[PDB]
């Protein structure tokens, strides 16, 4: 199966919380943003975090997402 571990979920949540302004719905731009604003030891981990962050942004566009506290939404 493909279940993101705790590390990926936490990293994606914190990255979205801290840099929601620059986030996009495109995976490649998100991974470039992650490369710019974060230190990820492995490329595979960076790709997984970027994908989960894109998924979280897609969910957020619909409405609120539990566990993510965005200042503008509140």
């Amino acid at each position: 199966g493909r279940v993101r571990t705790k590390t990926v979920k936490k990293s994606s949540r914190q990255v979205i919380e801290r840099y929601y302004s620059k986030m996009t719905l495109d995976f490649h731009t998100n991974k470039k943003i992650l490369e710019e604003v974060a230190i990820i030891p492995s490329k595979r981990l960076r790709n997984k975090i970027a994908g989960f962050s894109t998924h979280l942004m897609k969910r957020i566009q619909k409405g609120p997402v539990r566990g993510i506290s965005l200042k503008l939404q509140e």
Binding site: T7, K10, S11, Q14, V15, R18, Y19, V37, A38, I39, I40, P41, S42, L45, I49
Partner: peptide
């Protein structure tokens, strides 16, 4: 001189 594989640090905005 290498971080742990599962250690991710986010720079403060």
């Amino acid at each position: 001189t290498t971080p742990l594989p599962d250690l991710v640090t986010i720079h403060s905005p």
